[PDB]
Amino acid sequence: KKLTIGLIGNPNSGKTTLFNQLTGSRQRVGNWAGVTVERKEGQFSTTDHQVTLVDLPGTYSLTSLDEQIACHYILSGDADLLINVVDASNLERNLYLTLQLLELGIPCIVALNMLDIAEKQNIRIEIDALSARLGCPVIPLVSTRGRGIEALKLAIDRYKANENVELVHYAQPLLNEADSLAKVMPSDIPLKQRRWLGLQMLEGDIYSRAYAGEASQHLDAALARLRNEMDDPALHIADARYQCIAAICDVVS
């Protein structure tokens, strides 16, 4: 059976290296539609699947051209699953991107990279505790004898919808305002993603408005409403995300 998988992580996080390991010489260099950014695709197989792997440009956040490409692809829904390459030696910084994928609700597998760099600086990562808090599998990419890859291939064959765990705990009125923005958005987009798009707009993101159809004319009204209910809506959003990531890292690292 054929799956298409998007490969996503921070720049400088061993993403290209995983890409080459997975695909060997079975890769095509193309170009992202309408821009001159290079788009790599590659092929590998698993026990049950033939996999088309799409390397997305490194990015720290879904919220320059590169960043925008990753996000447009993530939101296009073309991919069945995403492989999220995470630097174990910079967990907290790297999970900011992971959180957005999970909030978007896209099937995810976290390939925990740079174990050897982590080990070297006395950082150990509690794999199952991370996995429980994310609601998606976490696969240590041991480089020794291709073990990591084999285990990743196993995870791919066993992939499923993420566990619907609570992630960031937003103040209710932000959720409320996001719900309101969400119901006036193009319905071709899942409710979960519509809610996420609303949340980004409230925090002040401009690229998100592009997918949200009508919503952007309701935003100033939404924001004007919110500022009666709290002192800094966008900062409360920043604060709840950080709260969530730091509570994870405290247990996990």
Curated annotation (Swiss-Prot):
Binding site for GTP 1: G9, N10, P11, N12, S13, G14, K15, T16
FeoB-type G domain span: 2-162
Ribonucleoprotein found in the keyword field: no
Induction remarks: Iron uptake is repressed by the global regulator Fur in presence of Fe(2+). Induced by hydroxyurea.
Tagged with keyword Cell cycle: no
GO biological process assignments: DNA damage response; iron ion import across plasma membrane
Binding of GTP 3, residues: D55, L56, P57, G58
Top-level lineage group: Bacteria
Cytoplasmic side: 1-253
Known role: Transporter of a GTP-driven Fe(2+) uptake system, probably couples GTP-binding to channel opening and Fe(2+) uptake. A guanine nucleotide-binding protein (G proteins) in which the guanine nucleotide binding site alternates between an active, GTP-bound state and an inactive, GDP-bound state. This protein has fast intrinsic GDP release, mediated by the G5 loop (about residues 149-158). Presumably GTP hydrolysis leads to conformational changes and channel closing.
Assembly information from the UniProt record: The isolated N-terminal domain (residues 1-274) forms trimers.
Protein name as annotated: Fe(2+) transporter FeoB
Organism annotation: Escherichia coli (strain K12)
From-to range in the entire protein, with total length: 2 to 260 of 773
